[PDB]
Symmetry: C3
Subunit: 358 residues, 3 copies
């Protein structure tokens, strides 16, 4: 692919070194194509940590919006003089400020943890780096970069012990390490529950939840909306488009398909969806997504430029055509009022519909 | 050879506009690098014959609209809300991005003209028009989907969809003729020439809408202003502190002179006619003269217009008489009386005649 | 000097027709390297004026935040219908709005004035121009560009008196000129850095910082401005900024800085002297040492400075002792007592002595 808006999961760059888990990096949106220049300063990172693990502390040149797509975790980050710690749930959304030192705990013994993060670099556009205070055989501590003279004077500690301190770190391999279930238990505004949002619509064929920045202060920094959609098997999300937001969508679970009308006159942009896949819906593009016939398709999405965004549906009871006056409809479609009704007033549900008519 | 002057004959016209015309200004960064600062801005001119209907569409761009001729009823829908407005000459209004918009000219005689400043929401300086219902050379975006998706979503047989679409490639053009009986049935805005920020004398008139006072202008962060320069007169040399002004010649002829220090100073100048567009980057001192035979009417978009201040270099209000006596003497190497003689002999402001009195 | 974040003073471009002083321009941060693309639209200007001088009025297509790094001055600028005038002291910080016509007075008899300016262009990214109403032998007045028709009509003044107006300016050499001390006296708000609530000082150095949250005039460029004096033989402990990218100017002295740069890490370092400028992108941990023989005095502009947080890696205000006990132990693979040993035995903050 060879699809300008579609990113297959095996195209993700896997961090070397990962250890007891894996960290994957999505490439730059402007790497293979120029059609995504509008969001060049956005990167996607997927973190997965094994049961009973500890993610080493670090900070990065980027703001972050985090979605827990699998399992649970305890997330803690420090900044200046404040420390904040939260127990994160499935579908929980949390913000981690740029420069804040962050570490993660997987306190569960059975279910593997997965986190999907949208990053907004503060330095060079679309470029970020991770800074580790304590490293491994394969991750250098940024403290070890300084000359010995600086460190012994700054910390007021003898030279011999500092190199003991650094050798203790070149013992472990990976920024994700195995840990006791006993220490991890001790280490335990707030998280945003997607399936608890007021902005939602659900029927027999799917459910939709969305957290908009206007109601959540922590989403106002990156100016981003975060939404969740489950399309039941054999169903679809009806054709619609976003007025303003450019949505980056991650396939959490299942398989399916999407069709997009792209004028970059028009052309049908389409791709097969599977777990780990990522695709982008630039604003204005009308989009339709179908689940598979045998399993549900579950998606989480990040809405870049999400303030005051409006989702306009082209089919269903809430469709926009239905807001035109009768004369406007007739003039636009070159048909009488009743033959227009036969097209835009025969669907009784919204958002999600079955591929087999009823 | 002028990097800031866009002659009307350079505008690209849309194919099969029908009962009217839609013209597109090139991207400001296409022929030159000197306008990189306003890369994400496009100018579109809509023009509709009497008794016409502009087909509904939306675009991936915010819009500020100025009616420069005639009357119109503008309607746009978004989600479940519809807003409709009766727009006259000099009315200024915003159409939100993603909103499905259509325009009506219910006037039986006056041709409609709309001048639009667009601010793309996707890729910088790039926008597209999405038509729900199209024509022979404009495709409906609904027809792009596979049939199985359309029949399932709309709950409508394949047979009716195939005919829904053919009824659209019967008309040619995104602007169509309509009956005034149906046009009449289909019946906030900012009036420029009612603004508190205005100045008027016998040599010209000026009106300006600032984003600080109008909320719909703060989305694009733009000021909208209008200037009519009476024939034989001129708008005195002045400059904008921060705003880069895009000017459209609505009517008349004339000329502009601007002091440009880019690729020390140099006189950039061009003669103006209707449909012409020229750009005034912030800091540039600019002077505009009407012709001897007709007034010059201009409409301007002030990009980055919040907290902007227009500084005049000549006239009653010129910035130089804000200096104390000692500063002017020190700066100009001249006594107080030889200086007053230069910067205190113009009794009017904004607009002056080319023959002094 | 092979350092992508370091700009030696001898690289500054000086305006030729400076006159009774000098004006230096830092190159665009994106000229030699791609590593500072994020601050593309920022320029540094250093103004130096001799005693008893008058800086001729001009405006520019750029916002500016000014810091007085030497001496005293009277700054005045006009815009639309307003006139604004201020007496500036050493360490004073002030904003000059874009498009405002400004001129500067040094009415001091022997201490030369120095001003360091950070500019934020309003037009093309990282590009600005200076517009002089009245010029000099090698500097055009922008009025002289217009046709004679326009000026005589606009100003209502005969041509001969315009053409003598311009000649009176083509006699002076330089845009900074000599002026009587008594007339400069006739020609007579700012943020005082050393009076900010956000400050820390010990025996080895002092630090002052003015953040945009507390001063409205810094919110236009969205920048924090700070000052640090590291006394000889001492150093400012390793630390990093959460989001602000700081442009630092060496006011006086010599020294050195070490920076951990992952652009997998590597040690970026350079010797500092007066006039030198170096950049600290967000996230980068930075350590600065004064010289053995003289103090090191620095001025810094924090681009994207709102809600910035300075995190120290050594001292009592250290960021690591905010981690939980089990977190530190797991993170450092050591018992709590051997960890205390390293991150709790420095008793001061910000500044500590070397050897
Ligand atoms: Cu597209
Ligand atoms: Cu220019
Ligand atoms: Cu670096």
């Amino acid at each position: 692919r060879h699809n300008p808006y579609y990113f297959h999961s095996q195209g993700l760059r896997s961090r070397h070194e990962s250890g007891e888990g894996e960290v994957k990096y999505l490439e730059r949106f402007t790497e293979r194509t120029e059609l995504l220049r509008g969001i060049e300063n956005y990167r996607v990172v997927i973190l997965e940590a094994n049961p009973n693990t500890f993610v080493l502390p670090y900070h990065k040149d980027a703001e972050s919006v985090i979605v827990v797509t699998r399992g649970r975790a305890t997330l803690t980050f420090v900044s200046q003089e404040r420390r904040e710690s939260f127990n994160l749930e499935y579908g929980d959304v949390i913000r981690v400020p740029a420069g804040a030192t962050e570490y993660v705990i997987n306190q569960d013994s059975n279910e593997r943890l997965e986190m999907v993060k949208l990053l907004q670099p503060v330095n060079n556009p679309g470029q970020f780096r991770e800074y580790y205070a304590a490293g491994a055989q394969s991750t250098e501590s940024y403290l070890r970069v300084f000359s010995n003279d600086i460190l012994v004077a700054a910390l007021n500690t003898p030279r011999d012990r500092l190199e003991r301190f650094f050798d203790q770190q070149e013992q472990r391999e990976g920024v994700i390490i195995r840990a006791s279930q006993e220490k991890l238990r001790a280490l335990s505004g707030g998280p945003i529950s997607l399936k608890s949002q007021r902005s939602s619509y659900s029927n027999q064929f799917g459910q939709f939840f969305e957290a908009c920045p206007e109601e959540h202060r922590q989403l106002q920094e990156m100016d981003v909306l975060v939404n969740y959609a489950e399309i039941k098997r054999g169903a679809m999300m009806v054709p619609h488009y976003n007025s303003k937001a450019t949505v980056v969508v991650y396939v959490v679970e299942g398989t399916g398909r999407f069709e997009m009308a792209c004028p970059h006159q028009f052309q049908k942009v389409t791709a097969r969806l599977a777990r780990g896949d990522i695709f982008v819906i630039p604003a204005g593009h009308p989009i339709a997504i179908t689940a598979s016939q045998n399993e549900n398709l579950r998606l989480v999405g990040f809405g870049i430029n999400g303030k005051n965004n409006q989702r306009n549906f082209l089919a269903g009871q809430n469709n926009i055509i239905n807001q035109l006056e009768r004369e406007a409809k007739e003039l636009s479609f070159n048909m009488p009022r009743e033959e227009i009704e036969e097209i835009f007033e025969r669907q009784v549900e919204s958002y999600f519909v079955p591929m087999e008519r009823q």
